[PDB]
Design a protein around this ligand. Sequence first.
Ligand SMILES: CCNC(=O)c1cn2ncnc(Nc3cc(C(=O)NOC)ccc3C)c2c1C
Length: 333
Amino acid sequence: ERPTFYRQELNKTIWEVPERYQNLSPVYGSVCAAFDTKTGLRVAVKKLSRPFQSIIHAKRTYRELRLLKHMKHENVIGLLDVFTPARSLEEFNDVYLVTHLMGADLNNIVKCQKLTDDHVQFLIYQILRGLKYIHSADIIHRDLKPSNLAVNEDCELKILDFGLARTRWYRAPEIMLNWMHYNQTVDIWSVGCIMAELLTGRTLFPGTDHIDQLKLILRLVGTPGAELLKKISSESARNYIQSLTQMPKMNFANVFIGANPLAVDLLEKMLVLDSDKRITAAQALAHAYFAQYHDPDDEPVADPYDQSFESRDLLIDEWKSLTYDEVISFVPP
Ligand SMILES: CCNC(=O)c1cn2ncnc(Nc3cc(C(=O)NOC)ccc3C)c2c1C
């Protein structure tokens, strides 16, 4: 039961999409905003770039599609559709993924603007809820930031681009210097930088380079204590820390002047150097800063997700064909 595609040489790249998708307006892939005719609903259409013209892209293509098909949560971007103009696995070299189009990202909401505590509470609460879900399926975002967080006019939020990362202002210090083995709280640190910027209106750690980034982070969290350093195996990481000039951790109360007391408590719990001791998503959800929204019975986790392919070393065409299977087997929500 195929459909009828049309061609749009607009962008500097050719778009070949189904009839229902009209008024393509451009906005690892090029994305267009478009108007779905079948639903009168505005969507986001993504054309994957050279999905199968390199082994890394091939695997990433398969990875992104599996994740989108499996993830069903109100705070995690969902897949409306996936298609290709190709009529056979031999013709397949293009992949399109369609999503809901939201009104704005977080990069603009705080665009030189301070929010209200309730606004912040609600935004951060949804990130944590969507994060708990993703983390439960054993997926980590890795590059969470204002731009991949999509919000609509009613402040309802969805997480974008998770699990692909397998733009320095939101990365955990341990994932930046490559020291102490990282865990899921790497996303918790990003949330910290985002929640802070949401309350203050300014970028928490607005670095100008890798080295200068660690500077700012350490200016606030203070240099790693003996407890942390003793757990750091990397010699190169140890040489760097031991070479820095000692610095005390600041009191977040005298940093986040005026913010709701509990906000500062949650913050302090999120912006910790010790990944071992950083609060988790599920744990941050139970925090009192969220008593108005917290609901232990409406904070779902993900059904088991088979990721074994991650340990696969296949050929481009093997990845290509597996994707083709995911494409044709797709059924809309
Ligand atoms: C607030 C205004 N902006 C938007 O609505 C908006 C802006 N973009 N930009 C890029 N991609 C978007 N969606 C998307 C995300 C993934 C994905 O997340 N796969 O990675 C696991 C896959 C395909 C698509 C189409 C997107 C949306 C929905």
